[PDB]
Design an enzyme around this catalytic site. Structure first.
Site, PDB file in Angstrom:
ATOM      1  N   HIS A 105       0.801  -1.221   0.000  1.00 54.94           N
ATOM      2  CA  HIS A 105       0.000   0.000   0.000  1.00 54.94           C
ATOM      3  C   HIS A 105       0.834   1.271   0.000  1.00 54.94           C
ATOM      4  O   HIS A 105       0.332   2.316  -0.425  1.00 54.94           O
ATOM      5  CB  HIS A 105      -0.878   0.078   1.253  1.00 54.94           C
ATOM      6  CG  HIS A 105      -2.181  -0.651   1.153  1.00 54.94           C
ATOM      7  ND1 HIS A 105      -3.099  -0.421   0.152  1.00 54.94           N
ATOM      8  CD2 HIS A 105      -2.734  -1.581   1.967  1.00 54.94           C
ATOM      9  CE1 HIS A 105      -4.154  -1.194   0.343  1.00 54.94           C
ATOM     10  NE2 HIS A 105      -3.959  -1.906   1.439  1.00 54.94           N
TER      11      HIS A 105
ATOM     12  N   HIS B  81      -9.444   9.887   0.137  1.00 53.46           N
ATOM     13  CA  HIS B  81      -8.545   8.754   0.025  1.00 53.46           C
ATOM     14  C   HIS B  81      -7.311   8.947   0.896  1.00 53.46           C
ATOM     15  O   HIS B  81      -6.528   8.007   1.072  1.00 53.46           O
ATOM     16  CB  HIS B  81      -8.182   8.513  -1.455  1.00 53.46           C
ATOM     17  CG  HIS B  81      -7.449   7.236  -1.704  1.00 53.46           C
ATOM     18  ND1 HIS B  81      -6.074   7.176  -1.799  1.00 53.46           N
ATOM     19  CD2 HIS B  81      -7.895   5.969  -1.872  1.00 53.46           C
ATOM     20  CE1 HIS B  81      -5.705   5.926  -2.020  1.00 53.46           C
ATOM     21  NE2 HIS B  81      -6.790   5.174  -2.065  1.00 53.46           N
TER      22      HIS B  81
HETATM   23  O1  LIG Z   1      -6.262   2.825   0.434  1.00 54.57           O
HETATM   24  C1  LIG Z   1      -7.257   2.175   0.072  1.00 54.57           C
HETATM   25  O2  LIG Z   1      -8.415   2.619   0.314  1.00 54.57           O
HETATM   26  C2  LIG Z   1      -7.061   0.825  -0.674  1.00 54.57           C
HETATM   27  C3  LIG Z   1      -7.885  -0.254  -0.359  1.00 54.57           C
HETATM   28  C4  LIG Z   1      -7.729  -1.468  -1.010  1.00 54.57           C
HETATM   29  C5  LIG Z   1      -6.745  -1.601  -1.980  1.00 54.57           C
HETATM   30  N1  LIG Z   1      -6.554  -2.863  -2.694  1.00 54.57           N
HETATM   31  C6  LIG Z   1      -7.590  -3.937  -2.641  1.00 54.57           C
HETATM   32  C7  LIG Z   1      -8.644  -4.192  -3.532  1.00 54.57           C
HETATM   33  C8  LIG Z   1      -8.996  -3.514  -4.725  1.00 54.57           C
HETATM   34  C9  LIG Z   1      -9.046  -4.252  -5.901  1.00 54.57           C
HETATM   35  C10 LIG Z   1      -9.391  -3.646  -7.106  1.00 54.57           C
HETATM   36  C11 LIG Z   1      -9.691  -2.291  -7.141  1.00 54.57           C
HETATM   37  C12 LIG Z   1      -9.645  -1.548  -5.970  1.00 54.57           C
HETATM   38  C13 LIG Z   1      -9.301  -2.155  -4.766  1.00 54.57           C
HETATM   39  O3  LIG Z   1      -9.266  -1.366  -3.596  1.00 54.57           O
HETATM   40  N2  LIG Z   1      -9.285  -5.264  -3.061  1.00 54.57           N
HETATM   41  C14 LIG Z   1      -8.683  -5.671  -1.923  1.00 54.57           C
HETATM   42  C15 LIG Z   1      -9.008  -6.749  -1.070  1.00 54.57           C
HETATM   43  C16 LIG Z   1      -8.224  -6.967   0.061  1.00 54.57           C
HETATM   44  C17 LIG Z   1      -7.149  -6.106   0.302  1.00 54.57           C
HETATM   45  C18 LIG Z   1      -6.888  -5.057  -0.585  1.00 54.57           C
HETATM   46  N3  LIG Z   1      -7.665  -4.874  -1.668  1.00 54.57           N
HETATM   47  C19 LIG Z   1      -5.919  -0.531  -2.290  1.00 54.57           C
HETATM   48  C20 LIG Z   1      -6.069   0.680  -1.651  1.00 54.57           C
HETATM   49  C21 LIG Z   1      -5.105   1.809  -2.051  1.00 54.57           C
HETATM   50  O4  LIG Z   1      -5.521   2.932  -2.422  1.00 54.57           O
HETATM   51  O5  LIG Z   1      -3.858   1.600  -2.005  1.00 54.57           O
END
Ligand SMILES: O=C(O)c1ccc(Nc2c(-c3ccccc3O)nc3ccccn23)cc1C(=O)O
EC number: 3.1.4.-
Length: 437
Positions: A102, A327
């Site tokens: 992240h 965000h």
């Molecule tokens: O910060 C945030 O709110 C954030 C939250 C989630 C993330 N990835 C993600 C996604 C996902 C898949 C595709 C399109 C968008 C998505 O969010 N599905 C999951 C499932 C489990 C863990 C993580 N997952 C990334 C960010 C970020 O912005 O780095």
């Protein structure tokens, strides 16, 4: 201002609310430095868009993309980057299940020095368009002269701490950047680094990462005040993990306990959690598609309805951003009347055990699944006892620019948390559309 905390530019607000905001093109501009090479740590990348954000004269300089993608997702990223021979990739190891890379950080090496940017935005158009996002800009760090032996270290230990964060990747491309950092003077840095990296940490290493890292810094570099039990904790985030069947499983037992630490001595502290309601998303600049970046699944939410009684609406009149969905992630410790804060953290870490760590093995080891990174502003690092809250985000300089409104406003009885994978077909958004996943 000493803080160098910025919001990203929002398309559609009046110019007064973008005065002093930064777009990615501003960060990468030649006015910030003559770029030699760069590293972009992130979660999601649109490579074609990203290269267009660099000044034309710098678009052929080496770029390293640090990501966590595997299998077909990894292949897609490599295919995006293949047309650009100056782009290299580093796959961060994610050896614990359900972890994510992240961290959002730029390392910018210039002819004139080095800059570190720790921020909250993915490297895609939508994340810099109509969202509330946070940026910390380091000073321009000068190079230490060849033959000169000095530490280049700051009172906050930022140089060693950043190197430690990078060493955790065990990656050859990042060892190169570690060597760059070694050669620069980071002593002017006034923020503390708070990182998460995947692993199981015990003993000496327990305090290195996640919520134990925050607890350690607050014990060592903040002081407790009278009536500290009345100073709330505020957490503000874009995603929510599975926290357990009740608040004692993690939220109020270890997470809140770390966040309420002040000073070195031996709870009714109020906890405010800020997360967009359905109405916040529907009426936002983007409309329902903003909820594509607020990942809270119904499968998770239905197991923890107790949590939603802590939820407060997104409101940001102070920065003209009430309709720019957040965000950014922030955590802070305001006074009972919200006029002062004891500290402020901007980070990539959402409200999840994966990001902050969960205790295991009878409380002896902290297990973290993900990479996260943020910077902590402590009054002691600025010669202060507390920070005044800046009344208007863009309007002495010792007042801290909190980007949303205080006090936070509780959800109304008809409000619901934004849940991204269920339909909303009862009232249309600002573009005339419903939400049908
Ligand atoms: O910060 C945030 O709110 C954030 C939250 C989630 C993330 N990835 C993600 C996604 C996902 C898949 C595709 C399109 C968008 C998505 O969010 N599905 C999951 C499932 C489990 C863990 C993580 N997952 C990334 C960010 C970020 O912005 O780095």
């Amino acid at each position: 201002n000493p803080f160098q905390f910025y919001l990203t530019r929002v398309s559609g607000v009046k110019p007064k609310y973008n005065s002093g905001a930064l777009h990615i093109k501003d960060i990468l501009s030649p006015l910030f430095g003559t770029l030699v090479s760069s590293a972009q740590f992130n979660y999601c990348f649109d490579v074609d868009w990203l290269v267009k954000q660099y000044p034309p004269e710098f678009r052929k300089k080496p770029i390293l993309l640090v990501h966590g993608d595997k299998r077909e997702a990894k292949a897609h990223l490599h295919a995006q980057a293949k047309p650009y021979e100056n782009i290299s990739l580093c796959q961060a190891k994610l050896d614990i299940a359900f972890g994510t890379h992240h961290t959002k950080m730029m390392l910018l090496l210039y002819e004139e020095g080095l800059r570190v940017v720790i921020h909250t935005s993915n490297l895609i158009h939508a994340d810099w368009h109509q969202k509330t996002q946070g940026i910390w800009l380091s000073p321009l760090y000068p190079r230490i002269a060849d033959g000169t032996h000095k530490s280049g270290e700051s009172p906050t230990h930022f140089k060693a701490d950043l190197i430690s964060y990078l060493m955790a990747y065990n990656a050859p491309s990042l060892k190169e950047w570690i060597d760059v950092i070694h050669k620069h003077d980071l002593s002017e840095t006034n923020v503390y680094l708070i990182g998460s990296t995947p692993g199981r940490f015990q003993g000496s290493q327990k305090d290195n990462w996640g919520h134990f890292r925050l607890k350690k810094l607050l014990k060592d570099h903040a002081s407790s005040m009278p009536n500290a039990e009345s100073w709330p904790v505020v957490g503000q985030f874009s995603s929510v993990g599975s926290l357990g069947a009740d608040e004692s499983k993690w939220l109020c037992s270890e997470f809140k306990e770390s966040m309420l630490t002040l000073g070195k001595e031996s709870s009714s502290v109020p906890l405010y959690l800020i997360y967009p309601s359905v109405e916040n998303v529907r009426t936002s600049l983007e409309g329902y598609p903003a909820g594509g970046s607020l990942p809270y699944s119904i499968q998770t939410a239905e197991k923890q309805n107790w949590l939603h009684s802590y939820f407060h609406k997104w409101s940001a009149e102070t920065s003209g951003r009430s309709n720019a969905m957040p965000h950014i992630k922030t955590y802070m410790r305001p006074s009972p009347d919200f006029s002062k804060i004891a500290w402020f953290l901007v980070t990539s870490a959402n409200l999840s055990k994966a990001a902050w760590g969960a205790l295991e093995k009878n409380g002896t080891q902290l297990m973290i699944r993900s990479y996260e990174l943020g910077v902590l502003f402590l009054p002691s690092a600025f010669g202060l006892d507390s920070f005044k809250v800046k009344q208007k985000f863009f309007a002495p300089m010792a007042t801290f620019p909190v980007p949303y409104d205080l006090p936070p406003e509780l959800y109304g009885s008809k409000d619901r948390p934004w849940i991204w994978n269920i339909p909303y077909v009862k009232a249309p958004d600002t573009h005339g559309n419903m939400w049908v996943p």
